[PDB]
Each structure stands twice: as C-alpha cells, then as structure tokens.
Design a binder for this molecule. Structure first.
Ligand SMILES: Nc1ncnc2c1ncn2[C@@H]1O[C@H](COP(=O)(O)OP(=O)(O)O)[C@@H](O)[C@H]1O
Ligand SMILES: [Mg+2]
Lengths: 90, 564
C-alpha cells in the first residue's frame, strides 16, 4: 500500500504539471500542424518557441511534502473495542 | 396483559406468524430476484461555476442530439408474456437477445392515444426474420432494407436465437428525451469545483455507457465550440476586414486568431469517460428482503394482536368458575358413527370422561331421581359426544344405563349406535309405540338406548305430553341411570321441558366456540323455567401455551400409560 500510494502521488505529480501545459500544448499542437508572408512565418516561429518553453516550464500546484510510509500498527481490527463490545453484548 | 400472556399468544399462533412472515419474505425474495437489475454509469466533467453547465447538459438541445445520434427513439424490448418472464429468464442463465436497428419508420398511426406505433419482430434464424404490426406478416432479411406497407425497417446483426420475439416501438423524439432525462443526473461533487459527475442509469449496462459518452462528447463539443466561436467571430470579421504595415499587423493577428480557434479547449473538461458499474444499483436485494421480513413480522403481530383482543370464547374453566359455574370436567379434543369410549378406551378424552363419571357419582347423589339431562348453549358443542360417551363409561362399570335421544330435531344417536330406526321416542310420544318397543341395545356398548324416531312436526309439543314423564318413571325403575341427550337451550326450548323430569342437569360448553356469557345466559334460562343446572362440562379443550401463562394451568391433562 506504500508502493501504491507512492505511485498515486507520483502519477498525480507528473500528471498535474502536464495538465497546466495542456492548454499550451494544444496550442502548440495546432501550431505544428499549421506551420506552412515570410514575416508572418517568422512571427509564427516566435510563437513556436514560446509555446515550447511555456509547456516545459509549466510545473505547478502540486508538491509532495512526505512520501508514503505505512503505520506498522494496524488500524483494523480494533481489538480492544471488539473484545469490550463482546463482553458488554454478552 | 404481560410478558407471559403475549409470549403464550405468540407461541400459540406460531403457525400463523410463520406462514405470514414466510409469505412476505417469499414475495420480497421473488421481487429482489425477478426485478430487472438497473446499472449505473458515470462520467466526470471538469469545467475550467458549474451551475449553468448543469442546466445545459439536461437540456433538450444536448440530450436531443444524443437521441438522434444513437437512434434512442427506436425502442426494442425482448418479448416476455408475463410480468416475471424477463426476471426468471435471467435466472435461468439465458442471455438476453439484442437486435441492432439503424433505420425504422413505422406507418405512424398517431391515433387518439397510441402516439407510439409498435411492431413485433420474430427471429426466424441468424439472417432473416418476420414482422407483424397488426397481423400483417412481412418477412425481412438482415442487410436489405424493407419498404413495404408504409413500414421502413433496417435490422442489422440479429444476435438472438430463433423463435424470440421483440417489441419494436418508435416513440416520439420528446418521449425519448424525457426517458433519458429521467435517468440522467448531473452533480458537482464539490459545490465549488469545475468538476461535473454525470451519472446515467439503465437496464442495459453497455448501452448506458454509450449514451453517457454521447452526452459527454456532445456537451464537450458544444462547450469548446462556444469558446471557439468568440475567436471564430473575431477572425471572421478579420477575414472580412483585410484590405501594408497594418496589413502585416493584421496578418499577425490573423494567425493568432487561427491558433486560438484551432486550439479550442472548452472550460469544461472530461477526466473520465463513461464506464458502467457492473454491480447493479437497483434492486437493493438486502434492504428489500430485510423489509420483507420486518413487514411480515409486524403484520403477523398485529393480526395476532387483533385475534387476541377480539376473541370472546372460553379459554379455561376458571372463566366459568369466576361466575359461580361448577365445571365438572374438561374434555380435550379427541384427535383419534363410532363411540370413542368403545373405539379407543385409552383415549385422553375418555380418561377425562371417566373423571366426569366419578365426579357425577358424587354430584348425582342426593338427587330426586337417576335421570341425568345433558344440554348446552349452542349446537355442535359436544352434548351428544359427551352424553353418549359418558353412558359408555358408566356402562362398563356394571350399571344399567339408558341413553334417551330426546333431540327430536337433529338427533343422530341411532346412526351412531346401529339402528332399527322405527319406533323411536317420537312414535312413543305420539302414542303409536309402546315403551318396550322403543328401547334398543348398543352393540359395542353395554347400555340400552331410545332413538328419536321420525322427526315430528311438533318436537317441543310432543315432549310436553304426559307420556314422556311416564317413560322416565318407568325407565327410572329398570335402569340405574338414564342419560337424556337434548337440543341446545339457546336454539330451542326442548331441554327446558325435559329438564323438569331430570334430577341432574349438566351443560356442555364448547372450548372456544362458546362464551362465558353464553353459558351464563343458558343456565339462567333453565332456572327461569324451573330447571336447576348442577354444573357445566367444558368440551373440546386444546393445548395452549397462553392458558399456561395467563392461568397456572392449561387444563388439557396428561397422558399416563406404560408405552407398551
Ligand atoms: N371433545 C371432542 N373431541 C373430539 N370430537 C368431538 C369432541 N366433541 C365433539 N366432537 C365431535 O364434534 C361433533 C359435534 O358433536 P355433537 O354431539 O354432534 O354436538 P351437539 O349434540 O352438542 O350439537 C361430533 O361429530 C363429535 O364427534
Ligand atoms: Mg346432539
């Protein structure tokens, strides 16, 4: 469960940075599909790199302060409340 | 009432309680098993709020687009003749047949009520099929479309077995939308987030996921399109406004608006495409069966609670003795035209009649004569059962007993003893028979008996004849005991006439059929006519736990024999 919670954290970490870039990635996606007067072609090249840098540097909103560790004491079953209820119910 | 009373009542009515509860649980289980399972699929939508988006998802514009895409106005239902044929077919492991229809145009009757025309498709094989709307039979084949009789139908990929029928309904577009809108719900799940949780329920697990995907995609296309439209409208005017430095400046704005429209991206977003939860959400079998048990119990309890508060019959001899009525015996029901005292002398009811025989030997002493009249309140209370068996238990003790069947109305003692039916008590009272010709011997008995004879038209007036007292005065010298069986006193007055010549009179009370006031009314009707009723005989007692808790004793009696 500690390996799973580490995977969930890292996937959400890798995924979150990607999400903010997704708005600029879709713009970059259509720009690459739209790369063919020449002065405008240079203006597109300036937008071409600006979308490359924005996507690459767009990592934010998620920080993992602590990695997953397992509490060695089980949370269930709660032996004391079970035995106590066993006495009282009996 | 207390704990013992109610627990005894529950023990006594345990058959009723168990049967009613089991019927309720059986109905609950049959519903939980035969009800069609309804699944639920969910998608997650994340808007870039989320208030106006909900009403646009549930609109007839978005939902109506899904009905057109998936042809949700073509309703196909497997044909099952009963209201349970679908559920049991699922239990038998039969996979439900499904046919894919891509084109359906019915003749559109559109009459006063049936705005939804319907046909019935009967699968003949994997390839061809039949159609019958109103008896008109039409043969169709997968592939080749059908345009006949004003009926357009295109069936693709019949996945079923031959013989299966299907009801194909072409419901109106609004009805298809209203059905979808009824099962389709939208939520926010955070009340602030841009997340929308689209859920959809239905009996088909695969179909509802295709529908929720169509709804989501349509909503996604529309949402993004609107954001795209603003930039498409500006780029539209730019294309309309292009007429050299400003021209190049507009060219930069030209592509900057091309990129935006191309990028698109609605504020709304999809994070999870629709998948169906394989566990049905309805019917909830556990809560249905549990309610079936609990509802069956509270119904069984109120019925038992009613029968307890409504019953008025006698429950124990104590009820009769609270009024001052001596109960000389309590005869149990004999579970065994025969005399019980002769057929089964060891019966528990004969053992109780022997206890009456010894109780009478002490009560019939100090009486005027040896004549014992046995009457009762209501018919079929056991007056003939007790008097005839009491005569049999006194006959084995070596006494001469005469059993007179003075029930000139419905007396059947002659049938119970073996009869020469001629010359009974009627023929004697009417003067057409001598006292010696009417006495007959019980074969397996030990006592003589006088039958009623032919039913007279005036039974109560015959018993008033002075011949009846002459017969009793004559028989009282040739017999040690005369037992007179009579009709019930609350029916006719015959017993009050006969009771004038009987030294001892006993009433027979039926266990649950007679009431305490009914027996008190009977004893006071005798006393009003000069007949002193010595006591009562409670008849037909059954073993009941309620009597053991209400009173200390159930008054049934114990079995005492050596088992061999
Ligand atoms: N304690 C009993 N046990 C078994 N059967 C009984 C008992 N009392 C009556 N019966 C039966 O129920 C019927 C009613 O008895 P019956 O003598 O005809 O009633 P009555 O003369 O009071 O109208 C009879 O067939 C009788 O055999
Ligand atoms: Mg009778």
């Amino acid at each position: 469960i500690s390996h799973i919670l580490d995977s969930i954290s890292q996937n959400y970490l890798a995924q979150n940075i990607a999400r903010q870039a997704a708005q600029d990635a879709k713009s970059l996606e259509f720009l690459n599909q739209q790369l063919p007067g020449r002065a405008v072609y240079l203006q597109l090249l300036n937008r071409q790199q600006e979308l490359n840098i924005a996507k690459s540097s767009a990592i934010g909103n998620v920080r993992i302060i602590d990695n997953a560790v397992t509490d060695p004491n089980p949370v269930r079953p709660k032996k004391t409340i079970i035995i106590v209820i066993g006495v009282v119910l009996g | 009432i207390d704990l013992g009373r109610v627990i005894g009542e529950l023990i006594d009515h345990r058959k009723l309680i168990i049967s009613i509860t089991s019927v309720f649980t059986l109905f609950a289980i049959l519903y939980a098993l035969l009800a069609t399972p309804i699944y639920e699929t969910d998608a997650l939508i994340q808007i870039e709020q989320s208030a106006p988006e909900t009403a646009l998802l549930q609109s007839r514009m978005i939902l109506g687009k899904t009905i057109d895409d998936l042809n949700l106005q073509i309703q196909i239902e497997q044909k099952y003749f009963p209201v349970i044929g679908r559920g049991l077919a699922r239990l038998m492991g039969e996979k439900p047949g499904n046919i894919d229809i891509t084109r359906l145009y019915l003749p559109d009757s559109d009459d006063i009520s049936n705005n939804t025309p319907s046909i019935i498709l009967t699968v003949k094989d994997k390839e061809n099929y039949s159609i019958n709307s109103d008896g008109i039979q039409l043969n169709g084949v997968v592939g080749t479309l059908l345009n006949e009789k004003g009926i357009s139908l295109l069936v693709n990929e019949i996945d079923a077995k031959p013989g299966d029928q299907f009801v194909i309904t072409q419901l109106p577009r609004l009805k298809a939308i209203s059905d979808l809108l009824k099962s389709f719900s939208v939520a926010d799940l955070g009340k602030d987030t841009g997340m929308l949780t689209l859920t959809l329920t239905g009996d088909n697990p695969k179909r509802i996921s295709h529908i929720l995907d169509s709804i989501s995609q349509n909503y996604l296309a529309q949402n993004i399109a609107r954001q795209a439209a603003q930039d498409a409208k500006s780029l539209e005017f730019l294309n309309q406004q292009l007429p050299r430095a400003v021209y190049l400046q507009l060219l930069n704005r030209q592509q900057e608006l091309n990129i935006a429209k191309s990028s698109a991206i609605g504020n709304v977003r999809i994070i999870d495409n629709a998948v169906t939860d394989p566990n049905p959400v309805r019917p909830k079998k556990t809560i249905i069966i549990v309610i079936g048990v609990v509802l069956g119990l509270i119904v069984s309890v109120v019925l038992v609670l009613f029968q307890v508060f409504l019953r008025r019959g006698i429950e124990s001899p104590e009820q009769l003795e609270e009024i001052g009525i001596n109960v000389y015996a309590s005869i149990p029901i004999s579970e065994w035209d025969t005399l019980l005292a002769v057929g089964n002398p060891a019966d528990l009811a004969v053992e109780a009649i022997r206890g009456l025989r010894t109780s009478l030997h002490f009560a019939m002493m100090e009486a005027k004569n040896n004549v014992l009249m046995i009457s009762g309140a209501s018919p079929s209370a056991g007056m003939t059962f007790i008097s005839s068996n009491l005569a049999a238990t006194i006959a084995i003790t070596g006494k001469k007993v005469l059993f007179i069947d003075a029930d000139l109305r419905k007396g059947y003692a002659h049938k119970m003893f073996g009869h020469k039916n001629d010359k009974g008590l009627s023929e004697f009272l009417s003067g057409q028979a001598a006292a010696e010709m009417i006495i007959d011997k019980v074969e397996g008995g030990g006592f003589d008996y006088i039958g009623r004879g032919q039913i007279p038209p005036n039974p109560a007036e015959l018993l008033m004849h002075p011949r009846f007292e002459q017969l009793l005065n004559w028989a009282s010298q040739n017999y040690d005991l005369i037992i007179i069986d009579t009709p019930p006193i609350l029916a006719v007055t015959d017993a009050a006439i006969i009771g004038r010549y009987a030294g001892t009179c006993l009433l027979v009370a039926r266990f649950e059929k007679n009431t305490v006031k009914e027996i008190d009314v009977s004893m006071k009707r005798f006393e009003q006519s000069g007949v002193v009723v010595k006591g009562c005989i409670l008849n037909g007692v059954v073993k009941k736990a309620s009597s053991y808790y209400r009173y200390g004793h159930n008054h049934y009696g114990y079995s005492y024999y050596d088992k061999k």
